Structure 1
Amino acid sequence: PVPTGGDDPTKIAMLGLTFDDVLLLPAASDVLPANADTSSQLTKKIRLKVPLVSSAMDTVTEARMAIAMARAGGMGVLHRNLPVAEQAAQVETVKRSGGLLVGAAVGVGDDAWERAMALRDAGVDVLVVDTAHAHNRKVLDMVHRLKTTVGDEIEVVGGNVATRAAAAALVEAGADAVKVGVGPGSICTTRVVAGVGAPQITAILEAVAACAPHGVPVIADGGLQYSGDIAKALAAGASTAMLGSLLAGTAESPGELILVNGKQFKSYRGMGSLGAMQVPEGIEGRVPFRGPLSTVIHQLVGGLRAAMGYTGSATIEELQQAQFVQITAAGL
């Protein structure tokens, strides 16, 4: 019998590693952190100066965040928990502030196609087909329909996935980037409510095995707690990281300042929380107030630059080839 039970070796398919399970190994380097090139592909056509995008959540990204992210060299993805006209108006607002990149989330419901076209009319650069489980005919069809209809002018992101097969299906459907993360978010309760999830280092490694041979970039979405996790996500093969919790405490995020026990916080809630939907798969929580976005991004990029120095990675493409050491429980 299999050592963990039963007679089927495939029943437990893999050992899933998360960010805390690994560290980047130093390697021969003549790269100064200040001189590293942090640019990376968000999609097949769109390259960002900083490999970071903000989550499509209503306590993270509206027009103010999207503008600040683009100015910092990344991009915002506008959330879709609002009327079509209002989302498209936020797209226009971002475009009014110069030649700034912006993305926007759409679902696969019956209002989704109309939402997508209105966003297109407003001048959006990236449409994100925004689901918790992309390995589904309705999601794949939406990605494909969008790519064939507006694909010349707009890049189409599909997600989320956590397996190689799912990433492969999105590639076949025509996705310009594949977003990875089922279960890892800081406000996520999918693991305890549904018992479903996939540790994010292993999910990225698997998704990249399907996407990289087709020249399709992977966006690592969820579970990033520290700037060092961004370096780990990219070294596992992702091309960008999408951040929720790490940006939710910034001045530019939606929501007001909250004072509890003499300390400052902002509300941060899952799009699957009871509040956002009003069976919940997210919580409503708090994150410490962090000040201006520009400063948070500077600290995050700073940690990434340090990782590039330690690993001898002159570019993000080189960082994607770095090696890990796996650590034990004691290592934490």
Structure 2
Amino acid sequence: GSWESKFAKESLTFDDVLLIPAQSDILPKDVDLSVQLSDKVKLNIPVISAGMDTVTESKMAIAMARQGGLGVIHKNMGVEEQADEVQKVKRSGGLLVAAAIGISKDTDIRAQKLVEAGVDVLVIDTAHGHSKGVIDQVKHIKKTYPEITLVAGNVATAEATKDLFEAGADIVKVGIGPGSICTTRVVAGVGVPQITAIYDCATEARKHGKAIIADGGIKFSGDIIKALAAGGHAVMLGSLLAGTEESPGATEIFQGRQYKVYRGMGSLGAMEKFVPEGIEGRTAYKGALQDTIYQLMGGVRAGMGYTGSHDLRELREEAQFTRMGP
């Protein structure tokens, strides 16, 4: 029974695996990085910036969209200000833009002002996507605005991925506890190692023909290709893009060294009652986004040249990994 299967499951993280080099015809410089998330949304690079207050505002989204990616404007501000941020991205060349929403009372009026501004996709940003309140809210958003692409999360199982897709989600966001600034593992004793989480969820998504977002735990370009090869359609970066000038955080100095503050959306500072699930820290100033993305995509291109993956579909469906010890 359920008592007997308590400890049956085994899971993997990024550090547990490596990609096996395979037959290659295509050079890194020529591989296809493009990915179709929904019928209306398609990106040139499989990178989305995080719906965080130390990561994405109009500046991040504009720079992300220019490099061939996407940006999710965070919900930790006024309803009026979030609507104003969406307009700025659209007026900057008719670029793709995303915004975050909750499950509370303010959601219904927040969702209308974001769509009005010209948003392409709405993100139901929750700590626990497999909740009754989330399921109902997913149904409501798609019944009110069926023309706007809906992203729902966060989840870490096939069952949770099934339910959200059945409720009305176009894209499911995968990630329970892998984030650099996350303490959910330590505070709630909950989590599913990201490589397995992506794999179990992508196994379900393949049965619906829908997209999954590999969200959190990415430290380097090598973790981008690992996340994508495990089944992820696109990656969500928080820590790697919070040091760039384009992030809302103000540039500071400490002992002649430049730093930008990066905090979790569940840390004391961001929440300004729930017990904190995130921490507040400091990350080194990286400079222009363009340089960070060029370094990260160069690593992904290199790995796709190693695996012989001409596009992301060939990486997601054919690339093989090997398991190793510490």
TM-score (norm 1): 0.95
Asked if residue 130 in structure 1 is aligned to residue 125 in structure 2, the reply is yes
Kept in 2, the 8 Å contact 1:66–1:102? The answer is yes
Worse-superposed segment, 83-92 or 13-22: 13-22
1:197 aligns with 191
Asked if residue 287 in structure 1 is aligned to residue 283 in structure 2, the reply is yes
Q: CA deviation at 1:230?
A: 0.4
CA distance in 2, matches of 1:13, 1:237: 23
Identity %: 59
- The aligned amino acid for 1:316 is L
- The aligned amino acid for 2:95 is L
Asked if residue 50 in structure 1 is aligned to residue 45 in structure 2, the reply is yes
Matches within 5 A, 1:173-322: 173-278=167-272, 279-320=275-316, 321-322=318-319
Kept in 1, the 8 Å contact 2:129–2:153? The answer is yes
CA distance in 2, matches of 1:176, 1:44: 9
- The aligned amino acid for 2:319 is A
Go from structure 1 to structure 2 and tell me whether the alpha carbon gap of 1:44 and 1:171 turns closer, same or farther (over 3 Å shift): farther
Q: CA deviation at 1:10?
A: 1.1
Q: 1:145 aligns with which of 121, 140, 145?
A: 140
CA distance in 1, matches of 2:174, 2:100: 15
- The aligned amino acid for 1:196 is V
- The aligned amino acid for 2:325 is T
2:90 aligns with 95
1:64 aligns with 59
1:155-198 deviation digits (Å, cap 9, x = unpaired): 00000001111011111012110000011110011111111111
CA distance in 2, matches of 1:200, 1:114: 34
Q: CA deviation at 1:240?
A: 0.2
SS class of match (1:213): coil
Q: CA deviation at 1:258?
A: 2.1
1:256-282 deviation digits (Å, cap 9, x = unpaired): 122223322110000100011111000
TM-score (norm 2): 0.97
1:120 aligns with 115
Q: CA deviation at 1:128?
A: 0.2
Q: CA deviation at 1:149?
A: 2.0
**Total equivalences in the alignment:** 323
Kept in 2, the 8 Å contact 1:67–1:100? The answer is yes
- The aligned amino acid for 1:243 is L
CA distance in 1, matches of 2:216, 2:292: 17
Kept in 2, the 8 Å contact 1:44–1:176? The answer is no
Q: 2:79 aligns with which of 84, 95, 99?
A: 84
CA distance in 2, matches of 1:216, 1:272: 29
- The aligned amino acid for 2:206 is A
CA distance in 2, matches of 1:318, 1:262: 46
Q: CA deviation at 1:150?
A: 1.1
1:24-53 deviation digits (Å, cap 9, x = unpaired): 000111110011000012335411000000
CA distance in 1, matches of 2:216, 2:254: 26
Q: CA deviation at 1:8?
A: 4.1
The unaligned stretches of length 5 or more in structure 1 are: 1-5
1:48-104 deviation digits (Å, cap 9, x = unpaired): 000000000000000000100000100000000001110000001111101100000
Kept in 1, the 8 Å contact 2:41–2:120? The answer is no
- The aligned amino acid for 1:155 is T
Kept in 2, the 8 Å contact 1:235–1:319? The answer is yes
Kept in 1, the 8 Å contact 2:83–2:113? The answer is yes
Go from structure 1 to structure 2 and tell me whether the alpha carbon gap of 1:26 and 1:223 turns closer, same or farther (over 3 Å shift): same
CA distance in 2, matches of 1:8, 1:36: 48
| RMSD, aligned CA | 1.3
CA distance in 2, matches of 1:262, 1:14: 48
2:162 aligns with 168
CA distance in 2, matches of 1:123, 1:47: 16
SS class of match (1:12): coil
The unaligned stretches of length 5 or more in structure 2 are: none
SS class of match (1:144): helix
1:3 aligns with none
Kept in 2, the 8 Å contact 1:41–1:240? The answer is no
1:293-322 deviation digits (Å, cap 9, x = unpaired): 011011111111001100000000001120
SS class of match (2:258): strand
Q: CA deviation at 1:7?
A: 9.6
